[PDB]
Amino acid sequence: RLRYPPEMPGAEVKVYKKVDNVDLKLYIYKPADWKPADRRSAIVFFFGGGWQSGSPAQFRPQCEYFAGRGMVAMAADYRVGSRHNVKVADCVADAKSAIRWVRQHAAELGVDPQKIVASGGSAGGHLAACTVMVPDLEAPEEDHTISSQANAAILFNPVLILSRERLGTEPKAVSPYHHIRAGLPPMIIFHGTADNTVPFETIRLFAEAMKKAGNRCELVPFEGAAHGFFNFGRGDNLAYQKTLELADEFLVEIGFLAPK
């Protein structure tokens, strides 16, 4: 089960942000035959936990998988309410910092700065959505001429409508649904139809409005599945395996990954 601080065997650790004397880390899984001159796609995972808890260990299985497939895969730590005096808008700033850091350091990471994927589950899927479509909420001292916007997203039962005391902004400013517009990066979404934490209908409504604006927004329902269905260990790792094979296919389709 998940522990914080996480153990991340085999990952290279880099501090991507220093803020209130906290050193926030990225845990980086490089593929075989990796070289700095490479231009691989990257994927950055944001754990779930209601913006209050959670662990980067959550997406360690997925990191190992996508590293095995030739991406530079990484799990980001970010500040959360039970550990740091933060609100949702601060978590957004951290998620954006992580994407900007990867892009800023793309040359030394062997990464194509235009093939950075944001990903996460629940609150972390909300953060990944924020890095593709929610404006502003940037760390004020960072270089805003380096974009923090990811080039694609892969979302595991995200929160996408926040339409209050722990947000740190007026709710629309952290609500991906309220920033749907044309010209957005492609994404795929996995959600359980029996999710009692985040109602499936909010996600269905989100995807229909994205498609109307011309965006590639694929929603894959998991019939009768509950919140968290996708994680390593839940069930018999069937949905775990299925989301990875569908996410893999999605990355191949958009040109970020080579076919197996």
Numbering used by the authors: 5 to 167, 185 to 281
Give excerpts from the publication.
In order to facilitate the purification costs, we searched the ESTHER database for a thermophilic esterase, and identified the Esterase 2 from Thermogutta terrifontis (TtEst2) that has been previously structurally characterized, and presents an open active site that could ease protein engineering for further optimizations. The recombinant protein was purified, biochemically characterized, and its kinetic behavior towards different OPNA studied, before performing a structural analysis of its complexes formed when soaked in a racemic solution of the OPNA. Biophysical characterizations demonstrated that TtEst2 is a monomer in solution, with some polydispersity and good thermostability at physiological pH. We determined the bimolecular inhibition rate constants for five representative OPNA, namely tabun, sarin, cyclosarin, VX, and paraoxon, to estimate if this enzyme could scavenge them at a fast pace.
Continuing this characterization, we solved the structures of the tabun, cyclosarin, and paraoxon conjugates. For each of these structures, the mobile region 165–190 could not be reasonably modeled, despite the presence of multiple disconnected blobs in the Fo–Fc map, notably a peak of >4 σ at the location of the indole ring of Trp180 in the VX-TtEst2 structure. For paraoxon, the strong electron density peak at covalent distance of Ser126 was modeled as an ethylphosphoryl adduct. This is consistent with the loss of the ethyl group close to the His248 through the dealkylation “aging” mechanism of cholinesterases. As in all the previous structures, the additional peak of electron density in the vicinity of the three different adducts was modeled as small molecules, a phosphate with partial occupancy (0.7 and 0.75) for tabun-TtEst2 and cyclosarin-TtEst2, and a carbonate for paraoxon-TtEst2, depending on the respective shape (trigonal or tetrahedral) in the feature-enhanced maps. However, the active site of TtEst2 being largely open to the solvent, there are no residues that could stabilize the leaving groups of paraoxon and VX, which are in consequence freely moving in the solvent.
